[PDB]
Design a protein around this ligand. Structure first.
Ligand SMILES: O=C(O)[C@@H](c1ccc(Cl)cc1)N1CCOCC1
Lengths: 300, 237
């Protein structure tokens, strides 16, 4: 198990870590989160109690380094940093544990939720979507725009998701206009899976990452990406059977985890009705359809 | 954006544009089978592609053979239309290519947009006008060339005959839409009006009769009366 120590908590803030949320009061004696499960990416995120504008946070993997949080009073936010001196870090963490100033990550043992939301997410792929190569962790916030959003303005602070656009020359083979617009299989399997992502696992990793940035930061461009990647599969008549079964599992856990009170902004009515009821794969998402119908029948 | 009554004069400016109407591309008669089921038989159709400024009509005849062995014909008809319009644009010299294509039915937007991806500077636009271009097959010489065709064929017309020698494009389009609206609401009456006076003839190289300016005012008034008459017959007013 691993630890993200905090130098201090000078400002009141809600801290979340993966799907969990908790409160820290102004100058409360808080010195981090411990017992973080090894083997998964994680995200630590923040919403200041005095300005909920800008949720922000850091994707990281404790196998890749020793990371801690320190508030910066000039830039006004909790910043992640790497500690390169490993003896110093263990010593710091051991002392904060002995003083029991660290909150305990509440991983119930029956629970596979986080695994199921991050199965295909790999820190190395996150670091290509979020370019900031001098760090091993990745910063994301509410307002960051995507490469595709900037085409339609700072590029250094962008989310470089794979651009999907159903009315583009990349999506449509000359001479197969009607075929390719109504059945996206060429675009899914040849352009995206074989050409760009190389395999279904990298495709699913980006899809899951996009969902999680939408949910945790309200990042609208990430929500657009998540829905686009779903619709591309559902709108393809030819999809490997293993991808369809996995997609159903992926979406099921995403819908299960979504805050009920956020369904109105994070779920696109048109895409979901199309995917569940009109698309080629309308009959291939049994678990996702069952949870959607019992949890959000209003949308449908 | 969408074309409507406010930007109506844009049709007659110096930016090349085409209206595309697909309502006569896929045409069927519905009939009973020996066993008492219903079946369709296709007949020849046409794409109606019109420059409203010049009157140039690019009439692409759709021969029934293009439907042979195809499924979901009404959906295919929109993509076939889009393919033919795209091929027409590519065939035109650069300086004759349209800057805008206005489709009379919104279901044509995506098919045409996808077929025109190679032309990102050509705007594809819908319209809120209810234009009577479906009635083009009520023009005898257009109907005749469509029905006689034995293979795909493009035929070029000027749908304004020689009117632009005497009137503006705006007035020429208003006349055409009034003629076509009348022929759509009561074809028999409209044709009776247009031909009642046998001394007024249709030149061999024209589609409509050789009316004087004065006789066109009379004719246009008769077409309005016809439209208003039918509107009262319909609604009992
Ligand atoms: O939800 C939980 O299990 C705990 C919790 C979440 C995250 C961490 Cl790291 C520690 C404890 N909450 C604490 C505040 O509110 C009660 C529940």
């Amino acid at each position: 198990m691993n630890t993200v120590p905090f130098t201090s908590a000078p400002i009141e803030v809600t801290i979340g870590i993966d799907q969990y949320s908790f409160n820290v009061k102004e100058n409360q004696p808080f010195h981090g989160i411990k017992d973080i499960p090894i083997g998964h990416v994680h995200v630590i995120h923040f919403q200041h109690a005095d300005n909920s504008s800008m949720r922000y946070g850091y994707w990281f993997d404790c196998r890749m380094g020793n990371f801690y949080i320190q508030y910066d009073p000039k830039d006004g936010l909790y910043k992640m940093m790497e500690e390169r001196d490993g003896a110093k870090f263990e010593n710091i963490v051991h002392n904060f544990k002995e003083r029991q100033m660290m909150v305990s990550y509440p991983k119930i043992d029956e629970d596979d939720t986080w695994y199921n939301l991050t199965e295909f997410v790999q820190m190395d792929k996150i670091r290509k979507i979020v370019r900031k190569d001098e760090n091993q962790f990745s910063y994301v916030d509410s307002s960051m725009t995507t490469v595709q959003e900037n085409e339609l303005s700072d590029p250094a602070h962008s989310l470089n998701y794979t651009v999907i656009n159903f009315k583009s020359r990349e999506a449509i083979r000359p001479g197969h206009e009607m075929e390719d617009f109504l059945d996206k299989s060429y675009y899914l399997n040849t352009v995206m899976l074989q050409g760009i992502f190389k395999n279904s696992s990298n495709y699913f990793g980006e899809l899951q990452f996009a969902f999680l940035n939408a949910m945790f930061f309200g990042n609208y461009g990430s929500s657009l990406q998540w829905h686009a990647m779903i619709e591309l599969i559902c709108s393809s008549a030819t999809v490997p059977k293993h991808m369809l079964d996995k997609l159903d599992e992926i979406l099921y856990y995403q819908i299960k985890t979504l805050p009920e009170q956020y369904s109105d902004i994070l779920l696109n009515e048109r895409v979901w009705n199309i995917c569940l009821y009109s698309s080629f794969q309308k009959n291939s998402l049994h678990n996702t359809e069952k949870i959607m119908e019992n949890k959000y029948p209003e949308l449908l | 954006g969408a074309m409507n009554s406010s930007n109506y004069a844009e049709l007659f400016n110096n930016d090349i544009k085409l209206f595309v109407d697909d309502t006569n591309v896929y045409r069927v008669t519905v009939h009973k089978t020996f066993e008492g089921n219903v079946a369709t038989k296709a007949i020849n159709g046409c794409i109606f592609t019109l420059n409203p400024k010049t009157g140039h009509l690019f009439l692409k005849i759709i021969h029934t053979s293009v439907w042979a062995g195809q499924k979901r014909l009404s959906q295919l008809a929109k993509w076939k239309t889009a393919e033919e319009v795209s091929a027409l644009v590519r065939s035109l010299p650069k300086e004759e290519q349209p800057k805008q294509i206005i489709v009379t039915r919104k279901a044509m937007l995506d098919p045409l947009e996808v077929h025109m991806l190679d032309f990102p500077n050509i705007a594809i636009r819908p319209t809120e006008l209810r234009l009577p271009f479906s009635a083009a097959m009520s023009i005898d010489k257009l109907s005749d060339v469509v029905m006689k065709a034995t293979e795909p064929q493009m035929v070029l017309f000027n749908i304004y005959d020689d009117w632009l020698d005497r009137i503006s494009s705006y007035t020429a389009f208003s006349r055409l839409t009034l003629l076509l609206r009348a022929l759509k609401t009561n074809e028999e009456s409209a044709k009776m009006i247009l031909l009642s006076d046998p001394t007024i003839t249709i030149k061999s190289y024209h589609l409509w009769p050789s009316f004087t300016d004065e006789q066109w005012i009379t004719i246009e008034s008769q077409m309005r009366d016809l439209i208003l008459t039918e509107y009262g017959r319909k609604y009992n007013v």
